[PDB]
Amino acid sequence: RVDVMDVMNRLILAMDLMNRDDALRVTGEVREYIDTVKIGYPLVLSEGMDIIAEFRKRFGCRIIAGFKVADIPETNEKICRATFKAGADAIIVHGFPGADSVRACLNVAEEMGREVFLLTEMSHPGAEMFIQGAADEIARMGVDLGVKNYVGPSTRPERLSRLREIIGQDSFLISPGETLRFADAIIVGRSIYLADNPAAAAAGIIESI
Amino acid sequence: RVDVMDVMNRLILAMDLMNRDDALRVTGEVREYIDTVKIGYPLVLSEGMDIIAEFRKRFGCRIIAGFKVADIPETNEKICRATFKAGADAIIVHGFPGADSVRACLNVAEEMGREVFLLTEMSHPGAEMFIQGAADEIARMGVDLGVKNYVGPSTRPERLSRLREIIGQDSFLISPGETLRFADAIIVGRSIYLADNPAAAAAGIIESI
């Protein structure tokens, strides 16, 4: 869809390394396979938010801040503004804190011309306690608020299908082969940056697509 | 109790200002009324994590990182280690993501000799959608995992009483008058740092204790 972002090769690199040198080095090794990188708190808190602008300038890539914002409205607003001011193209936000906390983020993204991704569900074991049960309602809340970008789990294909059903075919969905039957792009981390050779690892993944 | 932290005047300053100069200036104006300060992402993302060590050295205060960590276990571990390495004495973590995500934090705090505060419930309007309904279970999860420090709402005292009932009289509880009947310490922000004179504002609050 013309109004949703285009992720090269439908592959997003989750750059979870905490060392600036390593993060930039490994990303450089696979720069030809991706144009979108997700950066989280581990790297940003260890090296500073300036690392976001460094990635955009060194690789000409889109940066998604995988912060999973989950604070009160006023604080969410401040976190989003600081993150977008640092150059992030998009930010990932939790939906469990409610609609006002999500809208606070949407307001800033609108103002600054950036994007908000709503995290509807997580896949780690502990997600079963409260997150799994609220997933459908969180996705629906996003749809009702005009959210266009979503993050959903990949571990269970049928769950990604359910999410796609709720958000519709128009929405943009990313998830951490069959996954791409429902998601627009997949997020890969360790499988690439920890492999003996990240390039071959990334190349292999894309070939499967 | 002797095994729980002692917060001077039972008052914790929520330093939410995003400007280093202002945050340090206003904190300096009220330094005589508190020995514990809560710092969040707005300030840290805007000025860098080094600001935590700067506060501890300039004021000799305890720093609680009000990050409300809500990621997967591996990432929570990394966020906690980075935050504690930066000097934070404690970190606030969400319980909605489940037990493994909380334990990941507990592991790092144990290793580094720091503290974890479990956020059981929030008070902003949107909290009623999913957070309010999971609060009791989250508090019980904390108790079952040996969590000693908790953060609860202050808007509704009967809710604070319920939380105190679940965590017991031995647990340490902080909440953002009657509040101190159940909470060990109160967290005050805007009322202090935004007031015409934060010193008089802080002094007034304490006098009521």
Swiss-Prot record, chains A, B:
Keywords from the UniProt entry: Decarboxylase, Lyase, Pyrimidine biosynthesis
Looking at the UniProt record for this protein, which Gene Ontology cellular component terms does it annotate, in alphabetical order? Answer: cytosol
In the record, biological process GO terms are: 'de novo' pyrimidine nucleobase biosynthetic process; 'de novo' UMP biosynthetic process
Q: What is its EC number?
A: 4.1.1.23
Where does this protein act, in terms of pathway? Pyrimidine metabolism; UMP biosynthesis via de novo pathway; UMP from orotate: step 2/2
Catalytic reaction list: orotidine 5'-phosphate + H(+) = UMP + CO2
- The answer to keyword Repeat applying to this record is no
Gene Ontology MF, one: orotidine-5'-phosphate decarboxylase activity
InterPro entries given in the database record: Aldolase_TIM, OMPdecase, OMPdecase_arc, OMPdecase_AS, OMPdeCOase_dom, RibuloseP-bd_barrel
Which domain of life does the protein's organism represent? Answer: Archaea
Role description: Catalyzes the decarboxylation of orotidine 5'-monophosphate (OMP) to uridine 5'-monophosphate (UMP).
Q: Which family does it belong to?
A: Belongs to the OMP decarboxylase family. Type 1 subfamily.
Q: What is this protein identified as?
A: Orotidine 5'-phosphate decarboxylase
Q: In which organism is this protein found?
A: Methanothermobacter thermautotrophicus (strain ATCC 29096 / DSM 1053 / JCM 10044 / NBRC 100330 / Delta H)
The beginning of the lineage is: Archaea, Methanobacteriati, Methanobacteriota, Methanomada group, Methanobacteria
